[PDB]
Design a protein around this ligand. Structure first.
Ligand SMILES: NC[C@H]1CC[C@H](C(=O)O)CC1
Length: 234
């Protein structure tokens, strides 16, 4: 009745060397479900991503070696998919399914560097029909959601404020920030002027809060992004 969901922008998987490296890290972390961003695999190279122990994999890829997302499910986890929706451009993938008769919807997103919060709000609208009370939206938003997400505590811009409102209209909350309202933890440590920011996020339905046992930010040597882990009581 416990599953862990892990998100990491992996910064490219095209080379077999990097794929082998990612696989070892996953084996260690032993997540039930893993959301990866920036695989950079074109839609004709998706078959390249194989990780022993995580046979169920769902990918979304554009026509070029940029963006690219994947959701990997552990062989030990009974996830039964019912709907998969893939971005033509490789910036998100949504998987709906059930674990032990419990519905879960996972939207893995990689937002672009330019116009990130507007882009996420658009995807929310495009998929408004697919969001529900058991929805997790995780990945590299390429934007803070509040001042505490930046070591500078710079006010978030109007667009971000709009994204935050669209999220609340759908009864979606920043799950990390809700469990850790005062924390100053970061996932990207090369922000502009020697600054740090939390641009990776785990957002989710308010009704999932009762199931959230723990979150953990996992700094690593694989990527220029730290991973985020969520422990969920199914
Ligand atoms: N690499 C882009 C990333 C830099 C931090 C920035 C911020 O803190 O607003 C937004 C996203």
């Amino acid at each position: 009745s416990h599953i862990t969901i892990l998100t990491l922008n992996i910064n490219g998987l095209n080379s077999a060397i990097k794929r082998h490296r990612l696989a070892s890290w996953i084996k260690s972390q032993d997540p039930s479900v893993c959301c990866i961003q920036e695989t950079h695999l074109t839609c004709r190279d998706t078959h390249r991503l194989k990780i022993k122990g995580w046979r169920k994999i769902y990918q979304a890829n554009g026509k070029q070696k940029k963006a690219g997302v994947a959701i990997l499910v552990s062989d030990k986890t009974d996830f039964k998919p019912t709907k998969i929706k893939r971005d033509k451009e490789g910036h998100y993938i949504m998987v709906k399914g059930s674990i032990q008769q419990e519905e879960l919807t996972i939207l893995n997103i990689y937002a672009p560097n330019t116009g990130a919060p507007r882009f996420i709000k658009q995807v929310l609208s495009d998929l408004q029909r697919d969001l529900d009370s058991h929805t997790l939206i995780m990945g590299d938003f390429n934007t803070p959601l509040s001042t505490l997400d930046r070591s500078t505590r710079q006010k978030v811009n109007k667009d971000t404020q709009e994204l935050n409102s669209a999220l609340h209209q759908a009864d979606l909350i920043d799950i990390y920030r809700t469990l850790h309202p005062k924390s100053t933890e970061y996932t990207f440590f090369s922000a502009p002027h020697h600054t740090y920011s939390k641009i990776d996020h785990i957002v989710g339905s308010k009704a999932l809060l009762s199931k959230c046992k723990r979150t953990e930010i996992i700094t690593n040597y694989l990527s220029d992004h730290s991973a985020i882990k969520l422990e969920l009581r199914i």
